[PDB]
């Protein structure tokens, strides 16, 4: 299980439209806060996202960037980024190939299942800075990520 102070494989999947995006490109600015959610447009993963999306300036003021990721389609990544209005990339986990990466996939008798929520802060470097686990509350994944963000500061 990914955890803080180990080096992330980089990955490419696709986003809400369909574009392949590969986490050393996403990385090119600064960190990734890369956000795993149980499933698209359901209130809980509505509200997170909607805080990772009502952080943007705070965010952007540390040179970060949140991109949010499920086993959910494409199709349905893209109904919630324009119902929601996302600012940030919706990355398509559709067989959970990257979350069995990250140690959160879920499955039952070979069907895959929803993703373990969990929030991975990850450098330029792809070293793990912080991790948010299942247990914490929906705004502590974007706020416990930005703290962390800004104590690192320069």
Same mark, same amino acid.
């Given at each position: 299980?990914?955890?803080?102070?180990?080096?992330?494989?980089?990955?490419?999947?696709?986003?809400?439209?369909?574009?392949?995006?590969?986490?050393?490109?996403?990385?090119?600015?600064?960190? *990734?806060?890369? +956000?795993? @959610? =149980?499933?698209?447009?359901?209130?809980?993963? %509505?509200?997170? &996202?909607?805080?990772?999306?009502?952080?943007?300036?705070?965010?952007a003021?540390?040179?970060?960037?949140?991109?949010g990721?499920?086993?959910?389609?494409?199709?349905?990544?893209?109904?919630?980024?324009? *119902?929601?209005? +996302?600012? @940030? =990339?919706?990355?398509?986990?559709a067989?959970? %190939?990257?979350? &069995?990466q990250?140690?959160?996939?879920?499955?039952?008798?070979?069907?895959?299942?929803?993703?373990?929520?969990?929030?991975?802060?990850?450098?330029?470097?792809?070293?793990?800075?912080?991790?948010?686990?299942?247990?914490?509350?929906?705004?502590?994944?974007?706020?416990?990520?930005?703290? %962390?963000?800004? &104590?690192?500061?320069?």
């Amino acid at each position: 299980h990914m955890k803080t102070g180990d080096t992330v494989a980089d990955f490419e999947l696709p986003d809400q439209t369909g574009t392949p995006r590969r986490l050393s490109v996403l990385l090119s600015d600064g960190p *990734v806060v890369l +956000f795993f @959610y =149980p499933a698209a447009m359901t209130p809980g993963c %509505t509200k997170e &996202a909607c805080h990772f999306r009502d952080l943007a300036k705070e965010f952007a003021e540390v040179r970060a960037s949140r991109v949010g990721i499920s086993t959910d389609p494409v199709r349905k990544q893209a109904k919630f980024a324009e *119902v929601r209005r +996302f600012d @940030y =990339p919706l990355l398509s986990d559709a067989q959970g %190939t990257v979350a &069995a990466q990250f140690g959160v996939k879920r499955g039952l008798l070979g069907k895959l299942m929803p993703v373990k929520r969990t929030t991975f802060v990850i450098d330029t470097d792809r070293k793990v800075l912080d991790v948010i686990s299942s247990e914490f509350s929906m705004d502590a994944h974007a706020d416990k990520a930005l703290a %962390t963000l800004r &104590a690192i500061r320069s």
